[PDB]
């Protein structure tokens, strides 16, 4: 499958490419319905 | 993860992420209030620390 | 699943809807029960054995 | 020097003692953290603190040289501080406090600035039409009478309606009397009579923002023209000042400036279309403004000056009030939020105070603030102090119970009971148990639980959403057995069963589509399915499928 592991600094464009969305609230879960 | 008895166990990274997000949101809100530059400088220092 | 539905159909067996989270002797141990004690909350009914 | 002497031994022995380091340490007073900073700086080349007197070298020279250079800088340093709170105290310890008369001057500066802003927005009375339309819609019962406007500068709805009627009369008698020598006086009178009214901050701000949007559209058009006539054509600014300024409405300054026998005039032929469109938009907007743009420009300049004066005014008020918040904040140091966080949250409540403070009532600020500050600290400690956010109401209730409980314990020499707590409070007892369950803060998953292998608590928490491997083998065994018992059947019935239930496919087709393909009307396909089922039901064709029936 893979034959090497390359390492380098990450550009902001790359960091946005990894992500599936932006976290905007410090919330974790609801305190009664323990749902996200 | 939920534990027995209603207790919850959490990783320390959640605390650090919550710190970062709180200070970032506060900074964004404070930029829109045109606060005195002392406040925004201190907020930026806090964000850097977090 | 698609084959666990057909199996339940042919044999007409319905879902239990409850688990079997019962206490059992640890494997490899063999003794006699010499004592049992039950503690119940205030609002509970204190079943016959209690 | 002193640091170099300390290094001398470090290397000579390969190790040093806390005392010798602290002593050779430059007298340079260090605020603990600084001493902490240098210790690692020395550790960079590698050294053993060892509170007591005494295991190999693995330090790159590059690290070594850099640590040496920074170590030299430490001696030359004066007041290096790597601590935000300390830096804050210093940058704050640079503004003097204000005396009692020191807020009256600031307050009157603020009032004068806001009055100038109000008049400047008042001068542009086109909004009066928008205000009248809003009042008409409100009188159409679209909203409350008292919501649109917070009264007038006078106390009864009838007086407000009379004033609105007079305003409408003046508006109609002034708008339809432009034909110019006296129209300006009519407009001034209309503005003056409108000054006696008071508008809600939201509607006033919306009007200001709409005016700003219009002005920014006009400025965008002007700058587009400037970039299309200067950058592309190198048009001298003198020509623009001479022609564009003075009229600012007609096309003479641009369209009739093409015949100036200059290279820029000829080059304007290429960009005449876009600049002409900009001029058309301006002509319309200039008509919409109905006022000399230069006058408007001066209106905006005065408004900006007033706003800047007001902003710098409160700035100083809030600098002395930053001098404060530090006190109230220290009262919640261990409440689950960090000190600099508490202080910054208080600074926002302080800003909220300064903007809503009236000195006329002669309240000591240091009192129209010590509240706004505490409200903002507590609101925060409640909205962002726990990993699982709790409503402010639930937090109030929990604090009340924790108190009522302390008193009951002191007067009972015994922790109260969920029943006695319910009695002493006014709660249905079950509610008390629900509030007495709201789990406290999540436990740290790295909490040391060791003394054998240095293992943490999170290591012993298992995964409960995993399929056991004898259930993955069992599943594949049924997915096969089913193929056998089913294949041991004729084609059409086997496909009927396959479609009905979903074996090897991607949908549990209902009877309608199965009939479409097999041509029929449900009841027959229902017939084919039932025979198959009763068939696979008899023994001699359902022993292993029976085994898969947990029993
Ligand atoms: C001293 C060694 C550390 C470890 C053995 C101690 C230190 C803190 C203890 C936990 C905490 O109290 C929080 C919970 C309290 C509940 O009642 C029982 C579970 C719970 C996780 C405790 C189990 C255990 O006792 C812990 C992990
Ligand atoms: C020597 C240290 C003792 C350590 C082995 C004991 C002390 C407390 C025990 C944990 C707590 O009960 C909390 C959880 C309860 C779950 O049901 C099972 C996991 C869980 C972590 C427990 C596993 C283990 O039993 C623990 C860690």
Task: Answer yes or no: do B12 and D437 touch at CB < 8 A.
Answer: no
Work out whether the CA dihedral A22, A25, A27, A33 comes out positive or negative.
negative
* Chain C residues with CB-CB distance to D478 below 8 A: 3-4, 7
Structural determination approach: cryo-EM
Nearest-angstrom CA–CA distance, D542 and D371? 79
Which of B41, A12, B17, C11 lies closest to D543, judged by CA?
Answer: C11
Q: Which CATH number fits domain D385-465: 1.10.10.10, 2.40.50.140, 3.40.800.20, 1.10.1070.11?
A: 1.10.10.10
Give the DSSP per-residue string, D1-21. -HHHHHHHHIIIII---HHHH
Indicate the DSSP class of residue D462. Answer: P
| Contact status, residue D270 vs residue D307, Cβ threshold 8 Å | no
| Contact status, residue D535 vs residue D489, Cβ threshold 8 Å | yes
**Residue D390 Cα to ligand 1 middle (Å):** 24
Helix axes B37-49, B12-32, angle to 10 degrees: 160
Chain D, 459-498: which have a CB under 8 Å from a chain C CB? Answer: 475, 478-479, 482, 497
In this structure, what token pair is assigned to residue D137? 């819609």
Chain D, 432-451: which have a CB under 8 Å from a chain A CB? Answer: 438
Please name the helix (run of DSSP H) or strand (run of DSSP E) that holds residue D87, with its range, or none: helix D84-92
Give the DSSP per-residue string, D215-267. HHHHHHHHHHHHHHHTTTT---HHHHHHHHHHH-SSSTTTGGGTTS-SHHHHH
**Residue D459 Cα to ligand 2 middle (Å):** 9
Measured CA to CA in angstroms, residue B47 lies from B23, D226, D326 at distances of 6, 41, 19
| Contact status, residue D479 vs residue C3, Cβ threshold 8 Å | yes
Assess whether the C-beta atom of B4 lies below 6 angstroms from ligand 2: yes
Check CB contact of D85 with chain B, cutoff 8 Å.
no
| Contact status, residue D346 vs residue D319, Cβ threshold 8 Å | no
Assess whether the C-beta atom of D447 lies below 6 angstroms from ligand 1: yes
Q: D201: Cβ–Cβ under 8 A, 6 or more apart, which residues?
A: none
Work out whether the CA dihedral D100, D105, D110, D114 comes out positive or negative.
positive
**Residue C23 Cα to ligand 2 middle (Å):** 18
Of all residues in chain C, the one with the smallest CA distance to D507 is C2
* Chain C residues with CB-CB distance to D533 below 8 A: 9-10
Q: D116: Cβ–Cβ under 8 A, 6 or more apart, which residues?
A: D302, D303, D305, D306
Indicate the DSSP class of residue D444. Answer: E
Breaks (C-N over 2.5 A) in chain D follow: 54, 154, 179
| Contact status, residue D65 vs residue D55, Cβ threshold 8 Å | no
Nearest-angstrom CA–CA distance, D64 and D96? 46
| Contact status, residue D296 vs residue D215, Cβ threshold 8 Å | yes
In this structure, what token pair is assigned to residue D367? 């009192």
Nearest-angstrom CA–CA distance, D304 and D383? 37
Assess whether the C-beta atom of D443 lies below 6 angstroms from ligand 1: yes
In this structure, what token pair is assigned to residue D225? 């023209």
Nearest-angstrom CA–CA distance, D532 and B34? 77
Task: Answer yes or no: do A31 and D387 touch at CB < 8 A.
Answer: no
Task: Answer yes or no: do D533 and C11 touch at CB < 8 A.
Answer: no
| Contact status, residue D122 vs residue D195, Cβ threshold 8 Å | yes
Query: Min CA distance, A7 vs chain D (Å)?
Result: 22
Binding site for Mg(2+): what residues of D are annotated? 543, 546
Nearest-angstrom CA–CA distance, D66 and D73? 11
In this structure, whether the domain defined by D1-54 belongs to CATH 3.30.70.360 is answered with no
Neighbours of D165 (CB within 10 A): 10
| Contact status, residue D511 vs residue D525, Cβ threshold 8 Å | yes
Could you tell me how many CB contacts below 8 A there are between chain A and chain D? Answer: 10
Give the DSSP per-residue string, chain C. -HHHHHHHHHHT-----S------PPTT-------------SSS---TT-
Which of A1, A34, D186, D421 lies closest to B10, judged by CA?
Answer: A34
Nearest atom in ligand 2 to B7's CA: 13
Nearest-angstrom CA–CA distance, D348 and D354? 10
Residue to substitute from A24, A28, A34, interface D, most D β-carbons within 10 A: A28
Nearest-angstrom CA–CA distance, D512 and B28? 58
In this structure, whether the domain defined by D466-547 belongs to CATH 1.10.10.10 is answered with yes
Nearest-angstrom CA–CA distance, D318 and B5? 48
User: Using CB atoms within 10 A of its CB, is residue D141 exposed (0-12), middle (13-18) or buried (19+)?
Assistant: exposed
| DSSP collapsed to 3 states, D302-343 | HHHHHHHHHHHHHHHHHHHHHHCCHHHHHCCCCCCCCHHHHH
Nearest-angstrom CA–CA distance, D174 and D181? 12
Indicate the DSSP class of residue D502. Answer: T
In this structure, what token pair is assigned to residue D150? 């917070």
| DSSP collapsed to 3 states, chain B | CECHHHCEEECHHHHHHHHHHHHHHHHHHHHHCCCCHHHHHHHHHHHHHC
Tokens 């743009």 — which residue?
Answer: D293
Please tell me the number of the ligand nearest to residue B5's CA.
1
Nearest-angstrom CA–CA distance, C29 and D446? 34
Tokens 């001398």 — which residue?
Answer: D8
Nearest-angstrom CA–CA distance, D162 and D155? 12
Domain ranges of chain D: 1-54, 82-141+155-384, 385-465, 466-547
Nearest-angstrom CA–CA distance, D56 and D476? 57
For D462, what's the count of Cα atoms within 13 Å in the CB-facing half-sphere?
5
Measured CA to CA in angstroms, residue D12 lies from D33, D72, D422 at distances of 27, 19, 73
Could you tell me how many CB contacts below 8 A there are between chain C and chain D? Answer: 38
Measured CA to CA in angstroms, residue D369 lies from D101, D350, D359, D363 at distances of 17, 6, 13, 10
Of all residues in chain A, the one with the smallest CA distance to D390 is A31
**Whether the domain at D1-54 and the domain at D82-141+155-384 fall into the same CATH topology:** no
Q: D276: Cβ–Cβ under 8 A, 6 or more apart, which residues?
A: D251, D254, D255
In this structure, whether the domain defined by D82-141+155-384 belongs to CATH 1.10.601.10 is answered with yes
């Amino acid at each position: 499958e893979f034959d090497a592991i390359k390492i380098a600094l990450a550009s902001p464009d790359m960091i946005r490419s990894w992500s599936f969305g932006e976290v905007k609230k410090p919330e974790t879960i609801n305190y009664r319905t323990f749902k996200p | 993860v939920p534990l027995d008895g209603g207790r919850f166990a959490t990783s320390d990274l959640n605390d650090l992420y919550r710190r970062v997000i709180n200070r970032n949101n506060r900074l964004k809100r404070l930029l829109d209030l045109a606060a005195p530059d002392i406040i925004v400088r201190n907020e930026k220092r806090m964000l850097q620390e977090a | 699943t698609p084959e666990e539905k057909l199996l339940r159909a042919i044999f007409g067996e319905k879902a239990s809807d409850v688990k079997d989270s019962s206490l059992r002797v640890p494997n490899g141990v063999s003794g006699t029960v010499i004592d049992v004690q039950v503690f119940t909350r205030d609002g509970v009914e204190k079943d016959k054995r209690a | 020097s002193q640091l170099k002497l300390l290094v001398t031994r470090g290397k000579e022995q390969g190790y040093l003692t806390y005392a010798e380091v602290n002593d050779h340490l430059p007298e340079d007073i260090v605020d603990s953290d600084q001493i902490e900073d240098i210790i690692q700086m020395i550790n960079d080349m590698g050294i053993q603190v060892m509170e007591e007197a005494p295991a190999e070298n693995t330090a790159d020279e590059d690290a070594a040289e850099a640590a040496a250079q920074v170590l030299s800088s430490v001696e030359s340093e004066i007041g290096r501080t790597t601590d935000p709170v300390r830096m804050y105290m210093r940058e704050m310890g640079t503004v003097e406090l204000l005396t009692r008369e020191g807020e009256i001057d600031i307050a009157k500066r603020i009032e004068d600035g806001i009055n100038q802003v109000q008049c400047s927005v008042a001068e542009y009375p086109e909004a009066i039409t928008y205000l009248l339309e809003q009042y008409d819609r409100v009188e159409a019962e679209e909203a409350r009478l008292s919501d649109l406007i917070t009264g007038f500068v006078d106390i009864d709805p009838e007086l407000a309606r009379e004033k609105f009627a007079e305003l409408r009369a003046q508006y109609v008698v002034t708008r339809d009397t432009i034909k110019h020598a006296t129209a300006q006086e009519e407009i001034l009178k209309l503005s003056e009579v409108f000054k006696q009214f008071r508008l809600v901050p939201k509607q006033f701000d919306y009007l200001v923002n709409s005016m700003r949007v219009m002005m920014d559209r006009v400025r965008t058009q002007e700058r587009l023209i400037m970039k299309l006539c200067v950058e592309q054509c190198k048009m001298p600014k003198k020509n623009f000042i001479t022609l564009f300024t003075g009229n600012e409405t007609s096309d003479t300054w641009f369209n009739a400036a093409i015949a100036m026998n200059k290279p820029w005039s000829e080059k304007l032929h290429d960009v005449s279309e876009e600049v002409h469109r900009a001029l058309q938009k301006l002509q319309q907007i200039e008509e919409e403004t109905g006022l000399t743009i230069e006058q408007v420009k001066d209106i905006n300049r005065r408004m900006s000056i007033g706003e800047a004066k007001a902003r710098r005014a409160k700035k100083e008020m809030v600098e002395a009030n930053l001098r404060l918040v530090i006190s109230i904040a220290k009262k919640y140091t261990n409440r689950g939020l960090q000190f600099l966080d508490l202080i910054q949250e208080g600074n926002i409540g302080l800003m909220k105070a300064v903007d809503k403070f009236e000195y006329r009532r002669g309240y000591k600020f240091s009192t129209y603030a010590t509240w706004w500050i505490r409200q903002a600290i507590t609101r925060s400690i409640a909205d962002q102090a726990r990993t699982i956010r709790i409503p402010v109401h639930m937090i109030e209730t929990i604090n009340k119970l924790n108190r009522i409980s302390r008193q009951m314990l002191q007067e009972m020499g015994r922790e109260p009971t969920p029943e006695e707590l319910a009695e002493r409070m006014l709660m249905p007892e079950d509610k008390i148990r629900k509030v007495l369950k709201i789990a406290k803060e999540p436990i740290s998953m790295e909490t040391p639980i060791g003394d054998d292998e240095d293992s943490h608590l999170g290591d012993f928490i298992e995964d409960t959403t995993l399929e056991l491997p004898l259930d993955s083998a069992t599943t594949e065994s049924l997915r096969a057995a089913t193929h056998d018992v089913l294949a041991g059947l004729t084609a059409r019935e086997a496909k009927v069963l396959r479609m009905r239930f979903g074996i090897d496919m991607n949908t549990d087709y209902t009877l309608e589509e199965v009939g479409k393909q097999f041509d029929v009307t449900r009841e027959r396909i229902r017939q084919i399915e039932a025979k198959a089922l009763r068939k696979l039901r008899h023994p001699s064709r359902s022993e292993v499928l029976r085994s898969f029936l947990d029993d």
